[PDB]
């Protein structure tokens, strides 16, 4: 999930865009 | 509690990044 | 509308707290 | 949608839970 | 908004009041 | 209270301090 | 401890939403 | 109080409600 | 200023980036 | 006024996110 | 680190309130 | 920097003021 991927190391804006509809 | 607090910050960032499209938050 | 835009920011924080494990789909009107 | 119901009026956490997955 | 303004006020009071804390009522 | 006083006009850090315990 | 300080700020924002009209009382031991 | 109980492990909204006036 | 440009009509992240150092 | 203050609160948050390592300089109008 | 990113998010929020009209310059090497 | 001085031990509003313009 986003917590397992983005709370262990910082996610770039590109990686965050993975969760957009 | 680290996961919970981090998730609170992640949803705020998804709101801005996703603009008009919105996003899906799931655990 | 900026007021609408900032209100949504507050809504997603609240949905995060209440939805817990269920999560949620945020879409914009 | 959620904006029309909760930005023009105060929505409790009970009312917001109807928008969860 | 008054409700969202209040959300910001509680965050500000948490910072300003330090160990004293505050009491919040609507 | 603080809402009538600080959401109608800006409150300085000192004015907010009035609402601490 | 900063971890406790930042968690506390997350707790007051949640209390604002959960307590609504009742309000709440926050004070640090 | 709420710090030792809700910062070491996740509190339900029902648990947080105990801290309401 | 950023307030004049973004406090009535929505500024995307792309417009906001113009205010970065 | 208060609406501009609330707006600013959200803008600094967004600048923190998009500006990354570069940072940003903020001053009230 | 994630903790540093989270801490900085809170710090910019705190500087926005404390600095008022003066404002601040936020940078993160 | 502010992260080094305030991200482990708490900085009071007074110490944070050192970082204003
Ligand atoms: C990795 C991460 C966590 C929290 C917020 C972010 O923007 C990024
Ligand atoms: C009505 C409303 C708006 C934003 C957040 C909330 O919890 C409730
Ligand atoms: C007057 C006011 C409103 C909201 C937040 C503040 O710090 C001050
Ligand atoms: C346990 C916990 C800490 C902080 C905020 C919450 O909603 C819950
Ligand atoms: C689900 C929910 C909403 C509001 C208050 C509570 O204690 C629980
Ligand atoms: C237009 C605007 C105002 C405030 C915050 C934002 O992210 C965008
Ligand atoms: C020490 C510290 C860290 C983050 C935010 C604060 O208000 C204070
Ligand atoms: Cl945090
Ligand atoms: Cl707002
Ligand atoms: Zn946080
Ligand atoms: Zn707001």
UniProtKB/Swiss-Prot annotation, chains C, G, J:
Domain of life: Eukaryota
Entry protein name: Insulin B chain
UniProt source species: Homo sapiens (Human)
Residues of the full protein shown: 25 to 53 of 110
